[PDB]
Every structure is written in structure tokens, then in C-alpha cells.
Design a protein around this ligand. Sequence first.
Ligand SMILES: [Cl-]
Ligand SMILES: [Cl-]
Ligand SMILES: [Cl-]
Ligand SMILES: [Cl-]
Ligand SMILES: [Cl-]
Lengths: 272, 269, 280, 271, 276
Amino acid sequence: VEVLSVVTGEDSITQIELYLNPRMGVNSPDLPTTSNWYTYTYDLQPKGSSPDQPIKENLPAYSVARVSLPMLNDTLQMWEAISVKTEVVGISSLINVHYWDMKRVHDYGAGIPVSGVNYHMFAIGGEPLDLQGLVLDYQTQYPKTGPITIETVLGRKMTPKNQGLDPQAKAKLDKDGNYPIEVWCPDPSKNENSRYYGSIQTGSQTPTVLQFSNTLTTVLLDENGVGPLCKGDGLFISCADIVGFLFKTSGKMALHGLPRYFNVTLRKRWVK
Amino acid sequence: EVLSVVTGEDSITQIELYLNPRMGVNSPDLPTSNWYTYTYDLQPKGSSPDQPIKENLPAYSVARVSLPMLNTLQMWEAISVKTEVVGISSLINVHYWDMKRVHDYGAGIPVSGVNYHMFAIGGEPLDLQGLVLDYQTQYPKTGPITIETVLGRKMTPKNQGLDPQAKAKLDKDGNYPIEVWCPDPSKNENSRYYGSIQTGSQTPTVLQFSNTLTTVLLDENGVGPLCKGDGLFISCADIVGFLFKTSGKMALHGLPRYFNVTLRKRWVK
Amino acid sequence: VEVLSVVTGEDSITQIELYLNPRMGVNSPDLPTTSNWYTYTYDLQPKGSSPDQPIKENLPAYSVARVSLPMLNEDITCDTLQMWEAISVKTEVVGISSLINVHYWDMKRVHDYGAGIPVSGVNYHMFAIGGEPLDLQGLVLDYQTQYPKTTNGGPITIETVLGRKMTPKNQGLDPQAKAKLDKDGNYPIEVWCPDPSKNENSRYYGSIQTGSQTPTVLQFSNTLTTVLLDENGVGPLCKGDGLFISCADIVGFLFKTSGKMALHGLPRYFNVTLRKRWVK
Amino acid sequence: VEVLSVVTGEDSITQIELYLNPRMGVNSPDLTTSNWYTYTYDLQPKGSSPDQPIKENLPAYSVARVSLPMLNDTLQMWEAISVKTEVVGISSLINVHYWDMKRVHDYGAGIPVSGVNYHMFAIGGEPLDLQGLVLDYQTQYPKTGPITIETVLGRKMTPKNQGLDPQAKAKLDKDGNYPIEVWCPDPSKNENSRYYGSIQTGSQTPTVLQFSNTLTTVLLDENGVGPLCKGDGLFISCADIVGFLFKTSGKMALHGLPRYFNVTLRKRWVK
Amino acid sequence: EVLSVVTGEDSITQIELYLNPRMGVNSPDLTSNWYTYTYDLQPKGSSPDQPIKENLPAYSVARVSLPMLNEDTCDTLQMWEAISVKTEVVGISSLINVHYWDMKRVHDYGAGIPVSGVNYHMFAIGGEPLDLQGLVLDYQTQYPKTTNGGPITIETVLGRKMTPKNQGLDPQAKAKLDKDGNYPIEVWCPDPSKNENSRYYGSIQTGSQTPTVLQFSNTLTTVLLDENGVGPLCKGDGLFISCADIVGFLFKTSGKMALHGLPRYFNVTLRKRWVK
Ligand SMILES: [Cl-]
Ligand SMILES: [Cl-]
Ligand SMILES: [Cl-]
Ligand SMILES: [Cl-]
Ligand SMILES: [Cl-]
């Protein structure tokens, strides 16, 4: 790519709106009987014997969408993403401490609120996000494809090197609800045409602390003033928002997600 | 379409008000009213379905303020606000008569735990999106306005996520539960809102107050919220934590919020 | 009031130094026997039954002083006069280091054979600089609280300013429950906060921290300066040539062997810079 | 080593990408005890003296010397001006269903990785300078294996080694050989390196970490000079302890993650 | 009266040093097995408190001799002026040690409880000794006598017994940090009403098991200039450097607890300044 000048004219600027619903394990709300736990996992438990053999419902996954932009056309125009407004939706729902099956903090008290393990990330790019594979335990037996994991891309069993960084463990984030978060992270050695921002918080009952405001804007331009450039007139948007554990009366525990909203501003750019 | 700021003698004004919290016990003059600014006891039943009482549903505060009439017309434009949570100092009380002790012979457990704080300034009612923790919750009929009220029918599993139909406007004080409605980011172009949450059960309540802090309400193009029909809409929620009772029972508590908005006259097409 | 230009001259800038010792409940160190708990409350606890009847010693109050400034004018009849204007302040909490003491003889231990539980839990910190007394708004946790009557030697509370008993509305903001910080150790912190609807000629800064053993986290440095000018470049203006200084610094609980608990507070230092200003 | 002007030209700028896998104790994935790669063994106070820690319970610094292109009295040197760095695999720490994980309570999820964190990275034109200091001087470290204060002194530690001893100094020249708990960056040297670190103590303290491809560190000092690579060698160093793996039995092991680097360099004239 | 910066070849100097902590066991040259620690800290259980010197962490301090400048007791003179400092706590990484043999296990069969809890961090740079204020938790506490090997406390500088006012701000209880290991932290804080010729920076963290959280970097610099652009002026050609760095508790198997401290390094930059 050779980046030229910013197009000037009538319709040089456009805006994109959308939302992405979470993919925590029970991914659809339309299924006959299972959909009651939509936006949650099933119960998460150490097995007690080897090896771990987790079910797809216990594997929170990344959200993705390819957004179609107005069609523009070896010298050509491309859409350049310059900024974004993003926000986690439904934060106020987490004040509910009276859910029928909530474990009481102590005898005759309110429920333990959704708290503990958080994971938040969003990404905007002109092509699918690049992913690096790495797991806590290489002997974990993940389901076949279904979710895509390390042994799905290698075509063979994981070895101990997959507890660290293995250059062969790479994939592209092209499918909604299909790449487990505990297996995949953004690959820093690529993603030149993408911008990502993320964080984690561990612990069991750690406070969930979140802000929301319609006045916050993220600038997407790099150090040369270039934003992600959209190949084939497609904008790729990605995220994950785990907001903590639902604590059940029995002692069982499930992870919960929230949806994320996006407003992206783009402009036309000459490239060769 | 926005034109030029009005240059004149009396082109700037100041709006000053407060909003008392609406936690469930909403009025201070009832036969009952002893729990004004609190909920009743919050306690998961243990078997389904949940059917919450209206006194256990903290709701948004809102007020419409009438502005001096002005009439291509002139409109009031909000440009900045000073806002403050009132009575923060009251939470040092660790000797409420029926306060659960921290340990034997010790002081009471102070108001702490779940905090929720937001405020909004707009030229029209705040736009709301509905999303609940549990879709099988039996919210009181219309009393409080919830997703069932706006849809006409029962909630579906999809209301545990973002349902595009689950929309409403914050037009009534003490009538929209916080746990059902949050501000809608797909709209609200003529409003500015700011909010945060903190979960946990004994998480310290940590708050600041100062008369030196100002929020600028202008957007990127130098434009504030425009008051159509000479009405400024002010909205807030301020949950400060639980009061812990001897029995083990717990109730949520709120504090009032103070406002001082500055407006200027603006030409519009 | 019309603010004019800054006075240009020789002795146009002055400094004002002082400190205020905390008013936690035991407020004097000169008293016969009980003065061993100076800078502390007594033991705080729920009564068990209605209503609460708290004592003086269990009620931390705000500290305050009026400081007399050098007189500026040789004629008061003039429409235009010089007034002192506070522009900046250095302020610090004194004795923060003392809180490393985990060997008070009657300290509850963290566990068997261990050190004492350090001063921790509830914190409340505020200070104000103004050209008049700080404006206050009354608000309480529980309106049924029976505070000692001011006539009986007690502090000043909401009933005191209303002439009658509190009602359920005093758990919210009640326009009638207002007062002014003019006596040192007489306005209880749990009753009165600063009034944001007034206080245009004062600057206030504050915070709270709840929880029972929450860490006390505090900073100190003689390099920190708070600018006192408003958005128009005008600081508090000293009417009657008096500068009012207010504060409150609760730093946590002292945990006694039996399980009983008292709040503790620290003194505060101020150095205020003032300039001369013309007013109409 | 007097610094002159920045070299102007076509190929005056170059970029170095690499990653380093963590060295927690079990350091190779190729040995057979390698299934504990990126972890220590079980850390467990004995209850009586002395402490004789095994080499698998001593997380060490990661390091690489990168060979830069040939450049050549006055000569050209590579100067490090900026770095993009990121901790890799942070999302793996959401797993709370490891087969032998201790539960938070009955029927509950496993306790997530948390507690003790230690993060640091350094970019330099030469090896990083180290200072020795230990919790307890009586600790019997394994003999050379790991390089410790006794190794560099010849004789045994004394009580002064619980504070700063100017004789306890070393150079970070070997990957997985210098124990984090013995060696810290030496602030009295390191003029030709930049370093950044932090620690967090506690047992179940949350692990709180960020990642973004938008963050850059500027390596220039106050005079506008970055580290200068002597003999064309760039030294990259790091450590990233992310907390404890809590096991069913009561036992606990420390865990580490890998760190990725993209470093920008320019040619500089020196005398 | 502060005049102009002296312009020349050798008008700028740099001063380097470290300070080892004074936690109670202050020498490594013996009982020195507990150097950089206190002894065991325990509420006595009965009145009054009579604490041993090994249980009183104290401030570190050093005077540094600077090059002689005035080759003459004149009206106008050259003085060294401190303008910036790089400072750093040393040995932070040592606190990842969770296997010390005597470290209390978090739970049955687990790792030790790390060093954590009470933290106190301060550093100062000045042209004269740091000015101190005395204030104590309990005025009844009986600190050991100075002439019997012990530290300097309020009783020492008063020449009479502490009273209840010493639990607040008493203006008569003031002093100078002119001795290392002699002034206890729990007794003395920096006096904000003086120290016009010093710059101090401090903080505290209480609680029993609070995470110790510290940063280290050779890129961080503190600017020592006041609002008029003047650094501390070294009269008598002496530079005063002070500090304290308590990093938490060592939790012992038996339940007993001791406080721990770490060393601090300083790189100060100074220039020559004309003064009246
Ligand atoms: Cl997070
Ligand atoms: Cl909040
Ligand atoms: Cl506070
Ligand atoms: Cl850290
Ligand atoms: Cl600290």
C-alpha cells in the first residue's frame, strides 16, 4: 500500500452504527429450551480428574461483524476509519441483587452482585483481526469443529509449547461466536491495518467497575495520521465484554456478558 | 440547522435545582415514609419466579424546567453544568440503632457496596434502552414502566441482550427502574450523559465533592443541547450502597443531586 | 459588587499561616481526666433499640477559624475600596506518620500473637477557604435520631435551626435546613455538608471513604498548590477583613482489644497567599 | 563516547520485531517435565530452617541480544528511539476450569490466577546492570545453574546483602539464569539502557493488565538521545509474573506470560 | 536575595548516593540477622506502652560535602542549587519471595503471605536539615531514653513529660533531622510550617494485608524548582538527603509480625547560583 491524499468533495465523510450481542456460550435467544441462559455460560467447575473436557457452552467467544460500506470504484479510493464512539450497553441491569437464585451474602441478606472476572476488548480494522493462540493448559481437550481452537489450525494435538507463544498458533477472527477467548488473543506481531484496546481483571468477587458516556471518542489515526483502510469496502468490528459471575444459591457459578455499541466515522482516501 | 450565537445584553442565563432520590419509598409525607430515600429489604427468595415489589426498584429522577420564552428562531443552548451529590458527609454515621455490627461490641457496618451514579442534561427527554438480568422477572403491572409496558407483551429471552424494540423515553420522575433501563447510545444526540457502576457488597463507597468542578456540555462542533419548546431536561440516579440491619437484612440507599446549568441564546434554522 | 483591577504596589501580597486541631468529640486537652482521648471519639455502637440518642463525644465536628487581616482603607464611606483576595493555598494533613503505630497497648490484634490492627476504615477529608462563613446544608441518615439539645450544652443540628423536630424529608434535601460554619466543634459532620447552592465567595474540596478496615491512603508534599481563582480569575474576597478557614480530617478507627471502636482525626496546616484588589 | 548528528539518508531507519517466552522455573517445552512450562513448581514455606529453594522455584529474567546490520575516529551507531511492547496471552487467564484448580467454595468455579505480579522490560545498547538484594541472607541458593550473589562474590552472603551492597553487582547476559528475587535493575549504572517496572503483593490480589497496539514508549533521554548499540548489539530484557495457580491440595505455583517487542532504530554519528 | 545562574564550563555537578533502611536493627555488623526489619510488634495488653528501640523504624539522612565555591564571608556569594533528582527504591523484586522458611502459609499447604500491609514512603532534598513536627498516637507511651542508647523523641527535646496536646499539633515539639537512625517515624513528620529550603514528597498506606504496589524506572525525574524557578540552596556547601521506605510486614509462622524496609538511591543535579 502507498497512502496518498485525503479525498475532498461532497460525500467524503460517512458514519456507521451497530451493536453486537455477547457470545458467552449460550449464543442464541431463539432455541427451544436452552435459550434461558442466553448471554451466560453454563456452570463452570474444575473436573477433579484429568483431562479437562469442557463443553462449548462453557467457552465465551469473541463477537465479530463485517460491515458493508458504500462501493467506491491500480490507483483507487478506500474508506479510512478515523474515529469511534463505543459503549457497553445495559450496565444498569447489574444493580439487581434480588434475582430468585442469587446466593445471599450472609444469612437473610441481599444477593452477591455480578462481580469477579472481567475481560473487555474492542477492535476496528480494515480486515479481520489477527489472533495468536495460547492456553493455560495444553492437555485441555476442546471440542471439534463448533469452536475453532489451536489443534483445529495445527491439524494435530497441542504440545507444551502452546502454554507459551508458538508462531504456528495463528488465526483470523472471521466468525461470530466461534473463537474462544481463553484460547485466542490479538496478535501484536500483525494487525497493522487494525486498532485494538483491551484489559482483564481476575479474582472471584472483584468489584465490576464500568463507565458509560456519550461524550467519549477514540481517535483511530496512527502516528502518521492514517486510520485503518477498508479492503473490499468492508469494515471489521470486534469485541468481548465479560462483566463477572452470577453466583447461584447452590454455590455454582456462571460468567455473564453485555452487548457493545459502535459509532464509527470514516472518510475517503486515495491509495495506490 | 445551527446558526450563530446571539450577541446581546441578556443572552446568558442560569438554571438552579435539586432532585431528591427515588429508591422505592419515593415520598416523604405518607402514613411508610420512615424509609424515604431507601428501598425495602432486598432478599433473593430461593425459588422462582422473582416478583419484585415497587419499593425494591430504585428509579431515575427527572425534571423538566421551563425556560423564558424567546419567540429561524432563537433557542436556549446548554453549555456547561456544575453538579454535586448532596449529603455525602451523612455516610460517616456508624451508629444507626438497628445497624449490623462489624464484630461483637464494634461499630455498625457503614453504608457501602453497590454504587450507581449518572446524570444527564438534554433539550428533550433522555432516550432509554431496556435490558434485564433475568427475562422471567415478574415486574409490577402499570405503577412502574418496564419492557412489558412498552412492548404490550411478555419479555422474551432476547431481552437479556439488546432488543431494538425495548426503547422508551425518561418522561416521569420515579417511574423507570434503573435495573430495567439504561441510556440509549444509538440516539440521545441532543443530550449529554455521564455514568458509572461499582458492584460488590461491602465495597467502600468513595465519593468527591467540590464547587470548583465544571462539565462542558458542548460537542465536537462547539454545540450544546438545544432546548426545543423551551424545556431543559435534567436526569440522574445516585445509589450509594446498602444499610446493614441486625437481622442480616439489607436495603439500598440514595442521595440527592444538585444542579447549576448555564445557557446561552442561539440562532437556528 | 463590582470587581475592579489588581492593586499594583510594594506590600500588595501577604501570606497567612495557621493550623487547626481536629474536633472529634473529646475537643480539649486541658480537661481533668477524659482529655486522654483528645483527637478521638468515644466508642461508637448501635444502641439496639429505638431511637438513637448519641452523646457529644461521639460526634466529630468541623474545625473553623476566622483570621483578622491588616486594614486597607483609611475611609469606609468610599464607594470603591481595597479588599484582600485569596489566590492560592498550600495545605497539608499533619502527623500522617504517627499512623504506622501498630503497638498501642490496648489494640485488637489482626490474629493471635500478631501486631495491632492499624488505624483504618472510614475516612472523611475536606477543607474550605472563603471570604465569609461556609454555607451548610443539613442531611441525616435517620431523621428519628435525637441529638443532644444545643441548650443542654450540645452541638447545633437541624432541629436547632428549625425550632422543631426533624421529619422524613430531612433524609433528603430540605431547603429550610441551612446554617453557617461559625463555631469550632459545634456542627456535626454527619448532619452538615457544604451547601452547593450558595458558597460563591468560598472554595471547598472534599471526599469520603466508607468500609470498616479500608486502608487509609494519604499524601503529603510541600510542593502542592491549590489555585483558588474561579473561571473569571477572581478568588474569594474578604468582606470585613476576615478570612475563614474550615476543615475536617477523619482518618479511621482505633480498634480496641474488647472489639470496641473509636474514630480518630489529624490536624491540618494552611498557608494562604492573598493580594489586594479594588472593588466598587 | 561523544554524540554527533543523526544520519540522514534512505536506509537510516530500521525495525526489530521479536518475542520472549517466560522463564519461571520450568523453562523448556522440549523436555519429561515440560508440561509445567511457564510455571514454577510448588512454593511452600518449610516451617523450619534453612530455605534451600530448587531451581524450578526461581523465576528468572528473559533476555535476547539482537544482531543489527553492519554499519562500518568517528563511526555510525544504531540508536533506539521508540518501542511498542505488549504482554501476550492475557485472555488465557479467564480459564477458571483447570482440572486440578482449588474451588472458591463448594460447587464453585476455580480461583482465577492472581496474587503476586511482577512486570518489567528494558531496552539497552548493552547488557542491563543488576544489583543483588535478598529477603533473607541465610538462603542457600543452588550452586552454578542459577547465578546468585554468592556466585559473583565467591564467598557466602552476609547480613549486609539484605540491604544494598555495592559489591553485589552483575550483568544480565544469560536468558533464564538470573533469579528475579535476587536481582533488580541497578539505578547507579544503566546510563545506556531504559527500564520500567512494577510489583504487586498479596495472595489473591486481582491481576489487572492492559493491551493495545496503539501504545508507544519514547526511549530518548532529556537530551534527545536513545540507547546506543555498542558492537551492533541490541539488548532486550523482561519479566512478567501474572500470579498463582491454586491447586486442589492447597499447593500454589507462580505463572508467567510472554512479551512481544517492536523497536525502532536510527543511525547516529559518534566520536 | 537570589540572583543569576552562574554561567561557565563547570557550573553543573551531579551527586550520587544510596541510603540503607533504619527499621530497628540498623547495623549489619553483629542479632544483625534481622537487619532491615523491626523485631516482633505486639500490643502490650496493659498500660502503659514501653517499646524497645528495635520496634521503632526511623528516618535515614545524610549530609553531602559539595565542592568549595567561595574562595573568600562576603555579601554576594556562589551557592550550589539543587534543580532535579532521580530517585528509586532498591530491591523491589526481592519481595516476590513467597517461600521464606518461616513465612506463615496463606492456607494449609500453600505459599507464604507476601510482604504486604503498612507502607510508608518519603524522600526529601534540602540545603539544610529537614524540619520535623512531633505528634503521637498515644501521649502515655514511654519511649526509651536517648542517653541509654535510644532514639530522640518528644520527651528528649522538651526536657519534660508528654501531655495530651501531643496527640495533636503542639508548636513546642519541633526538631531537625540531623541524625540517622535517631528520629522515629511514628513520632516525627515533616513540618509544613518550615522547610522553605527543602522539598519533601511522602505517602502512607494502612491496613494489615494491603498489597504493596511500587514502581521503578530510570526515566523518572523530579524537578526541585519552586514556583519562582529556585531550587534548594546548599548553605555551608552541604546537601541534605532524607528518606523512609517501609514496605510491609513479614508474616511469621507463629503469628508474630515484623516491619520491613528497603534502600533508596539518589542522583541529584546541581548548578551554581549567585545569591546575596
Ligand atoms: Cl477488565
Ligand atoms: Cl459508580
Ligand atoms: Cl477520603
Ligand atoms: Cl505489577
Ligand atoms: Cl505509601
